[PDB]
């Protein structure tokens, strides 16, 4: 019964336009709770969840300042890597940073993450021990050496083991009604005649949270693992998620197929068939 606090940072240079754009989004589990975007006039760290309005002014001002300064460092980093690689300014380049903590039911750290990518590829990563770095090419070897020199691992490890865990506990408390809601999917099967002989049965899962779900189809108890089509789980836009899964079946045989739904918010799994009337 775990939870996670995660931040996603992106700097993207725009050749012809101005300075690189810097974007931050922060998540508790599947819920976006804060953001920052340097394309805003007078850009600030912003709440993306209503319950984050409980953090007072000092929180927002300190996070804004950190973000702004971090954006500046991402800009320096972009210039540094252009230099390592002798690349053109006519192309845009992208630097990404993801870090965070997973905590178990006991509130203790299960694992910490801290990793960067340049132009969509792994550049440097903090190893699971939170003490050593894995580099990729010899540009990232240089970066690794510099981080070893300023004992960067110690600073990131200390954050991930202490404040990351504590802030996760705080946000879980502040946002408990939203964050612990376990909204089960409301499910139904729809019917779409396909070719006079065949029909599509589509099983719907709507308004659920968290995103993790299983939505499966069976023919007389046999799992249709080779036949079933499904879409990626997708946000409704309101904090909940959606999914569907479908099978093509012989018209007049629809009764033999079942949709099966599992989710944290369902104490028992759902079994559904297409209801004609």
């Amino acid at each position: 019964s775990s939870h996670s606090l995660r931040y996603f940072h992106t700097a993207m240079s725009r050749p012809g336009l101005g300075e690189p754009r810097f974007i931050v989004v922060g998540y508790v589990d599947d819920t976006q709770f804060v953001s920052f975007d340097s394309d805003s006039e007078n850009p600030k760290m912003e709440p993306r969840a209503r319950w984050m309005e409980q953090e007072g002014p000092e929180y927002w001002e300190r996070e804004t300042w950190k973000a702004r300064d971090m954006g500046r460092n991402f800009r320096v980093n972009l210039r540094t890597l252009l230099g390592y690689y002798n690349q053109s300014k006519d192309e845009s380049h992208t630097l990404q940073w993801m870090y965070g903590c997973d905590v178990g039911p006991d509130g203790r750290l299960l694992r910490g993450y801290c990793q960067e990518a340049y132009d969509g590829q792994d550049y440097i990563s903090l190893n699971e021990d939170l003490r050593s770095w894995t580099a990729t090419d010899f540009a990232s070897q240089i970066s690794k050496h510099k981080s070893e020199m300023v004992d960067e691992a110690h600073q990131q490890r200390a954050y991930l083991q202490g404040p990351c865990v504590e802030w996760l506990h705080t946000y879980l408390r502040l946002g408990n009604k939203t964050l612990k809601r376990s909204d089960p999917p409301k499910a139904h099967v729809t019917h779409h005649p396909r070719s006079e002989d065949y029909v599509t049965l589509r099983c719907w899962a709507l308004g659920f949270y968290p995103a993790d779900i299983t939505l499966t189809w069976q023919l007389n108890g046999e799992e249709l693992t080779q036949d079933m089509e499904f879409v990626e789980t997708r946000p409704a836009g309101d904090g909940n998620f959606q999914k569907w899964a479908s099978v093509v079946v012989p018209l007049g045989k629809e009764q033999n197929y079942t949709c099966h739904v599992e989710h944290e918010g369902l104490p028992e799994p759902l079994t559904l068939r297409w209801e004609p009337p």
Partner: peptide, 9 residues
Amino acid sequence: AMAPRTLLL
């Protein structure tokens, strides 16, 4: 809250 600093590459 965010990491106190980022890597200098």
